[PDB]
Amino acid sequence: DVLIEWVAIYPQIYDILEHINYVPSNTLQRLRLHQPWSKIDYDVWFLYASDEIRETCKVKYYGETKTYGEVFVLENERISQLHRLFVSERAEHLKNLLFDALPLVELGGNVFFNSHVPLPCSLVLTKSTQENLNRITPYLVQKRPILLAGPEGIGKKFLITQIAAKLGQQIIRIHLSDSTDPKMLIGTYTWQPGVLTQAVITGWILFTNIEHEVLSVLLPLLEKRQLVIPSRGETIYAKGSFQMFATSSMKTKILGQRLWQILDLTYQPDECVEVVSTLYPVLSIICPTLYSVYKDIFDLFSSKIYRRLCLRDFYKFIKRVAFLYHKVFKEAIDMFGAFIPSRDGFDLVVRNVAIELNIPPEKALQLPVFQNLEHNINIGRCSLKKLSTIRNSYAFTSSSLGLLEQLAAGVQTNEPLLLVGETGTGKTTTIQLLAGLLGQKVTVINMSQQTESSDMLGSTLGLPLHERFIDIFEQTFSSKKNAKFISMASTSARRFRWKTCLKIWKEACKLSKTVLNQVELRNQWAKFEKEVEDFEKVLTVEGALVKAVRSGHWVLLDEINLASLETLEPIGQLLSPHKNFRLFGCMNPEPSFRSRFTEIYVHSPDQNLDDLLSIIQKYI
Amino acid sequence: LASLHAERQRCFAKLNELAHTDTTLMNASKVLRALQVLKPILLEGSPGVGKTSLITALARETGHQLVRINLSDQTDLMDLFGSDVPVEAPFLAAMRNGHWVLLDELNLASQSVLEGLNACLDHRNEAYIPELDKVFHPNFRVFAAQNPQGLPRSFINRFSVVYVEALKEKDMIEIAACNYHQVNEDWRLKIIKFMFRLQDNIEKDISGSPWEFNLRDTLRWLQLLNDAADYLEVMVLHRMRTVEDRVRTCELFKEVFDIDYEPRTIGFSLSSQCFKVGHSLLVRDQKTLLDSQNILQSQLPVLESVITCINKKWPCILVGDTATGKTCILRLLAAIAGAKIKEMAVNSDTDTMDLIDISRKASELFTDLSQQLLNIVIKYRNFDIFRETSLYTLTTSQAFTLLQKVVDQLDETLVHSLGDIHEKARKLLAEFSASPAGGYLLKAVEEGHWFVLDNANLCSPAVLDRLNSLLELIVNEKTTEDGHPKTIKPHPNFRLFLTVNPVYGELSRAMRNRGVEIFLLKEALTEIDKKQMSLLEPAPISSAVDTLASNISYIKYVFETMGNYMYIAHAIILALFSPRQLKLLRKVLTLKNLVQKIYCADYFNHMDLKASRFMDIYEYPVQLREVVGLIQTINDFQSVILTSHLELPETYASGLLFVSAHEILDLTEEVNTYLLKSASAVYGSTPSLWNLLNQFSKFLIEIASSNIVYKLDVIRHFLKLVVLWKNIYVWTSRFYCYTKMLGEWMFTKLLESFLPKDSLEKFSELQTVESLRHYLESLYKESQILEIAESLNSGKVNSVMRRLVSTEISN
Numbered sequence A: 001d002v003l004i005e006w007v008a009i010y011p012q013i014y015d016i017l018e019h020i021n022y023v024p025s026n027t028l029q030r031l032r033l034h035q036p037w038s039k040i041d042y043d044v045w046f047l048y049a050s051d052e053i054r055e056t057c058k059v060k061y062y063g064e065t066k067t068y069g070e071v072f073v074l075e076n077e078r079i080s081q082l083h084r085l086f087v088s089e090r091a092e093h094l095k096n097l098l099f100d101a102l103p104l105v106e107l108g109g110n111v112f113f114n115s116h117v118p119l120p121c122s123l124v125l126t127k128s129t130q131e132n133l134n135r136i137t138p139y140l141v142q143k144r145p146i147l148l149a150g151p152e153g154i155g156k157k158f159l160i161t162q163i164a165a166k167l168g169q170q171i172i173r174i175h176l177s178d179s180t181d182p183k184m185l186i187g188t189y190t191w192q193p194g195v196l197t198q199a200v201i202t203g204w205i206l207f208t209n210i211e212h213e214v215l216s217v218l219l220p221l222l223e224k225r226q227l228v229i230p231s232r233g234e235t236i237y238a239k240g241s242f243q244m245f246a247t248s249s250m251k252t253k254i255l256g257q258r259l260w261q262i263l264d265l266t267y268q269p270d271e272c273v274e275v276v277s278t279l280y281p282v283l284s285i286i287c288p289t290l291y292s293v294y295k296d297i298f299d300l301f302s303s304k305i306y307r308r309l310c311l312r313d314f315y316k317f318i319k320r321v322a323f324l325y326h327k328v329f330k331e332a333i334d335m336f337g338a339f340i341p342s343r344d345g346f347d348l349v350v351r352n353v354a355i356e357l358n359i360p361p362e363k364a365l366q367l368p369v370f371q372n373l374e375h376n377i378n379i380g381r382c383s384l385k386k387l388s389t390i391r392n393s394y395a396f397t398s399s400s401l402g403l404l405e406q407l408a409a410g411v412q413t414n415e416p417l418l419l420v421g422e423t424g425t426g427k428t429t430t431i432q433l434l435a436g437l438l439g440q441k442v443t444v445i446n447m448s449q450q451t452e453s454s455d456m457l458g459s460t461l462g463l464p465l466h467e468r469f470i471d472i473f474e475q476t477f478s479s480k481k482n483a484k485f486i487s488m489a490s491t492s493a494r495r496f497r498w499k500t501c502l503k504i505w506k507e508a509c510k511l512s513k514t515v516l517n518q519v520e521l522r523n524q525w526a527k528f529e530k531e532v533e534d535f536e537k538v539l540t541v542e543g544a545l546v547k548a549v550r551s552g553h554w555v556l557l558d559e560i561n562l563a564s565l566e567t568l569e570p571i572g573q574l575l576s577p578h579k580n581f582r583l584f585g586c587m588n589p590e591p592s593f594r595s596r597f598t599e600i601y602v603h604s605p606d607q608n609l610d611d612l613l614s615i616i617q618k619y620i
Numbered sequence B: 001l002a003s004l005h006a007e008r009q010r011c012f013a014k015l016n017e018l019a020h021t022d023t024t025l026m027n028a029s030k031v032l033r034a035l036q037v038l039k040p041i042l043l044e045g046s047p048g049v050g051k052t053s054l055i056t057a058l059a060r061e062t063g064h065q066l067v068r069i070n071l072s073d074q075t076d077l078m079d080l081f082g083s084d085v086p087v088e089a090p091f092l093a094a095m096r097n098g099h100w101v102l103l104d105e106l107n108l109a110s111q112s113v114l115e116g117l118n119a120c121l122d123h124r125n126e127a128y129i130p131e132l133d134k135v136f137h138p139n140f141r142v143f144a145a146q147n148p149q150g151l152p153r154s155f156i157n158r159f160s161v162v163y164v165e166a167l168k169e170k171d172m173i174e175i176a177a178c179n180y181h182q183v184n185e186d187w188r189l190k191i192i193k194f195m196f197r198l199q200d201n202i203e204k205d206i207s208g209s210p211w212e213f214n215l216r217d218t219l220r221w222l223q224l225l226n227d228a229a230d231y232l233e234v235m236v237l238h239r240m241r242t243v244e245d246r247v248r249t250c251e252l253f254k255e256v257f258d259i260d261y262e263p264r265t266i267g268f269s270l271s272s273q274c275f276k277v278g279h280s281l282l283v284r285d286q287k288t289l290l291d292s293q294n295i296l297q298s299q300l301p302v303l304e305s306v307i308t309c310i311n312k313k314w315p316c317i318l319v320g321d322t323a324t325g326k327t328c329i330l331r332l333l334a335a336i337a338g339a340k341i342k343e344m345a346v347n348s349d350t351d352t353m354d355l356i357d358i359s360r361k362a363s364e365l366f367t368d369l370s371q372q373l374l375n376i377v378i379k380y381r382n383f384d385i386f387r388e389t390s391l392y393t394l395t396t397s398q399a400f401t402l403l404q405k406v407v408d409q410l411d412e413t414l415v416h417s418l419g420d421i422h423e424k425a426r427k428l429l430a431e432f433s434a435s436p437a438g439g440y441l442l443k444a445v446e447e448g449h450w451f452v453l454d455n456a457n458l459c460s461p462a463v464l465d466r467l468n469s470l471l472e473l474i475v476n477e478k479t480t481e482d483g484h485p486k487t488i489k490p491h492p493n494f495r496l497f498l499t500v501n502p503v504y505g506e507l508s509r510a511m512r513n514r515g516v517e518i519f520l521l522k523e524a525l526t527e528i529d530k531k532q533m534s535l536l537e538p539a540p541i542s543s544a545v546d547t548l549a550s551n552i553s554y555i556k557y558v559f560e561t562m563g564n565y566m567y568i569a570h571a572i573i574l575a576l577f578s579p580r581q582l583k584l585l586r587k588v589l590t591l592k593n594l595v596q597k598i599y600c601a602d603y604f605n606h607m608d609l610k611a612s613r614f615m616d617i618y619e620y621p622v623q624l625r626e627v628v629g630l631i632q633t634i635n636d637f638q639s640v641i642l643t644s645h646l647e648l649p650e651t652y653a654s655g656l657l658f659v660s661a662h663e664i665l666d667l668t669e670e671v672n673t674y675l676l677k678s679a680s681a682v683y684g685s686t687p688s689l690w691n692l693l694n695q696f697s698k699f700l701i702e703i704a705s706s707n708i709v710y711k712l713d714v715i716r717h718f719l720k721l722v723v724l725w726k727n728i729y730v731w732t733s734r735f736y737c738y739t740k741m742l743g744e745w746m747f748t749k750l751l752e753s754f755l756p757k758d759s760l761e762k763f764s765e766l767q768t769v770e771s772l773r774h775y776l777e778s779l780y781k782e783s784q785i786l787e788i789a790e791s792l793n794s795g796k797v798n799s800v801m802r803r804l805v806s807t808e809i810s811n
């Protein structure tokens, strides 16, 4: 009712309460209906014209007094005094006071009312994240398109994810890329459902890797909540909660004008409480002692630091320590510096760790085959309940035992893993330990040639068919010596120059029409002609990782150290539905892909001066 | 450079050591020299021309037909030899009948059609390999449009290349002679020499862009002149983006045209039937957009320069720099005009086919039904009945409910005019259970909307080339049937408005050379920044796109922007507000309260026959249709009142004379301590001052209300006495000297000093220069008030009022 009095005073909370249930009136439909796109048809006095029609129509009861039309000037200061008064917090208290005629009034940093549902609501904090949620309550109430450009690894995608969890909203997170077609934008033909069009249809939404022309294909949504559906021919009223939040840490796009940018910031040592929040039985500051161990690892790095210890890295260390803590854990952080190409540097990491830990167990520093029956893996303080057992050369040297135990520890944790070396046999160890555990399927995508789309996602076919059928019908209708060069130019133009042959179809169709056992061939020439016309109007897949993640193979992405910016694969890693995948990639010696995969270097498993006797035995 | 011309002489030196238009005739003489040897003739010329230099010469050539073979991408060799018919042609006819075969755009060919043209170029009858063995008229010389460079070094070394040069300057005057009807001919030679030396000086220094400055712009300025030297400078140097280069261009304009390019201040007159700014009106007639961006008064210096470009049917190019506000310029322009803005973001590597399945037509039908019902209910507001339910359905395949729509189209003459489109499209929509077969600008080029090719810096050269084919209208599509082009000539209200930015690459030199380039920048003036960012503050200045609101808005502003005083105040205030605003201020009835007395006295006598001088004075010069702006009219003839006529300025001072006169006269009716003694002694004894005041004030009110009073710069001298009578009624012993001063301002027509002669001779029958003090005080304080009002006029600190009172302050 009259609370549209304060309609645009606060943000569209009142407009959302109207979108629950509201109707018009004279001054009401004068007021609220002025939005950026509609069609009025109730009082189109306002939009019909600005001549004495609109310059002289009427306005009913403007301050409950009936001026004429230009009581906009009565109102476009009256609302502006309210817009000044709302600069003086308890603004949401005034909005909840103003709702005095009990819906799903969500609080938050400021307020919301998205009457959909609650959610699981995992990622909580009371930290610099609380100031970030303070900095993003405002525009998310105001429903402009937002962004976020803090430094890397603040969990900004997780920030938006848990923010949507505070809402009743499901953040479909399209990682748009520099090879994107308009398909997941809208679809295609030659009429598809579309993905971005689906979220616009159903109603928040999140995009990533926006920084690296199809931005303009979304700029129609950013100017107003509607899209350019070119084929179906209808802009979509996006009448829900379609807040198209994005993420990138730069500023170079049109959203730099269009979207209300915002700057997140994270005090990293509050991670100490966070994992304390996250892992309940890690309430000891042995956790924070491991954070200090990460600091000491940074101080040892600062032979060549090709890695950067991060809060993601410390969270993964908390993950592997949590995998431990069901059952000391010197071996755990000993794995957490295994990406160290000098074994002396590994020893120095071990000394730093033992400084953070208790007394020197170098016994553990150079420490098994299997217990391989039904949960058929037990290699090295780590087991694997293998599935549907199938199985060449097996159980090699102590270095092979170490790499297999490391890959076991990775596989139990559902993390990413690589192995840089020089042999081309870390893949052999990978497929070996795959089958020796079970063997899911070694989807060994050599990702160095098919550059970026063919891993991720995804035409003279009818031309030879119609060349055959037109050769047959010109054999039926015309004659050998008669249409001879016409046949020869139906031939020479058919050898993959497949658009001038439309003329050789059409003119032969014309003479076949002029040729009018008989009517069957008549319909044959006619249907051939109509099909040729459909082709001559037409003349003017399944990704391997997707098949894996739906299937259950092992994604052995080899040779990532010679690839391109195929960082959509890192986005698909950052997605983690699944049961048990295996993204055991294989490098061969990237500042953020190679900083997001828990790597384990190889140590050239051939060198123990009698271990080659083992492989020599298995070979000979 | 042109020194090669000199070096040509040097070349001619080595030659001598070895020993229709004018320039167009030299180029045609070159082509005549070229035809003397049997080969293809290539036009190796700089861009902008086109093959007109050979499109015309055929008419002066022995009946030689013009085979304009527009060789393009989709062009097979079978589309150039043909004849392949199942037994039971322009290039071909040109091989058959002898003709001039103009091969347009050889560089855009498929490189076997290139091989076919390589085959055909023999002197002897051709023996083609690629389709047939050979296709033998024996004079069929084929001319070659060597396009903007690509061509193969064998195809481009078997032909013969002719160097098409540019236009000579006296020859450019000859080309201007088709425009010199409404042109001062020496001013025409000045504009031509100005563009020539402008390009010749701009191509030698820092100023960034290619800076084309071509003869099409010269003819554009010449044909701009014929619809009345300021507007030429405005829309031929608003398109220099860096302000230092604008200063240098103004200096070159002074070097050539010999004037001072002081910027003519523009102003937003926004009445009902017309909204206008600064030597540019707009047919503000039915309004589609219903926008949400405001007037942006600081953009008023360039919002005019496209509005003129919106009226001259030139190619609108809101070029320039990012986030400065460019979509809002065209948005506001065609928002107030109502020209149905519709935009296409041509930077997505879009294609030429992108500019030029049952449910799609069903939705378009629902939308157009809603549009026609809207325009119906605009005029004859009588309809309701499920017709309103038909409208609600219209804004709502399984489209069987659309058949219900036709039932509503089933159940008068206005209904007949709606159902003309509606029942026809719905009877076609009865076929919504049948067989299917499933443009952008061709919608707007056939409708009346205004098209906005937004962000259109980087799409393609050739897409804008097929656009520039329609830039100069008839459009040749290819979605037509068999053999007919069917160009749509509905261009009336169809304007190509192209945004750009400088971030990507600039628009190509062809579309730069065939458009009206208009930069934009950032200023943020005072009321401008007040109104743009007004979401905190209480008020904009021009707070609508409807004039009855904008009137009360600006009248609430400048009657609140007001902060021997109130004379020049009340005068300038009732001098800057509009006459419609004057009626409105009277309708809306400290100093503003007393202004209602000035309103009653102005509607009595503001401009009784002063408006007759203004009408007749205004009438001789080109003038608007109505009475919307006044001080902007005073500012608007800024070259004319720089002609020393002062037709508009003298009216401005006459207003001050009338208001000051009313002040002096009410003071004198109050006259009806020593002056108090004399005025009492109308009824100390023997007065001499009271008559000396009352007769001169009668002379004042005589000078207020009468034909020669309209015919009265001398009004400033009378106002000197007005300040003098003020200063004596303040300066009311010294009667002798004060009378001698009044006698001087009389010594500065009969009656208006005759009354001073009577009162002075009476006071002399009874019987320092500080009048300059409060005089120059009044001059300075009115100069201050002039600036404070010229703020709310435009927002730059200068005016014809200001320059006038400044030259008065020289005295």
Ligand SMILES: Nc1ncnc2c1ncn2[C@@H]1O[C@H](COP(=O)(O)OP(=O)(O)NP(=O)(O)O)[C@@H](O)[C@H]1O
Residues within 6 Å of the ligand: A122, A123, A124, A125, A129, A152, A153, A154, A155, A156, A157, A158, A274, A278, A311, A312, A315
């Ligand atoms: N308030 C929080 N509550 C719980 N976990 C948090 C919180 N803040 C951060 N984290 C964790 O911090 C990690 C951030 O890494 P992650 O989001 O996986 O990659 P990323 O940081 O988003 N890459 P980027 O999107 O560029 O920041 C996540 O694993 C979160 O669990």
Ligand SMILES: Nc1ncnc2c1ncn2[C@@H]1O[C@H](COP(=O)(O)OP(=O)(O)NP(=O)(O)O)[C@@H](O)[C@H]1O
Residues within 6 Å of the ligand: A393, A394, A395, A396, A400, A423, A424, A425, A428, A429, A432, A433, A615, A618
């Ligand atoms: N888990 C394991 N069990 C048994 N043998 C293993 C295991 N892991 C590695 N090996 C051995 O490690 C070696 C891997 O070498 P391999 O990569 O096959 O040679 P290669 O030179 O790369 N083949 P090629 O491509 O022709 O050059 C083989 O001798 C394997 O038997």
Ligand SMILES: Nc1ncnc2c1ncn2[C@@H]1O[C@H](COP(=O)(O)OP(=O)(O)NP(=O)(O)O)[C@@H](O)[C@H]1O
Residues within 6 Å of the ligand: A257, B292, B293, B294, B295, B296, B299, B321, B322, B323, B324, B325, B326, B327, B328, B329, B332, B455, B499, B500, B501, B532
């Ligand atoms: N009348 C106006 N009302 C409000 N804002 C305006 C107005 N005129 C200009 N602006 C400013 O200009 C913006 C809108 O135009 P704008 O978004 O800059 O088009 P654009 O982004 O410049 N297109 P481009 O040239 O590619 O940058 C607003 O956000 C303001 O910064």
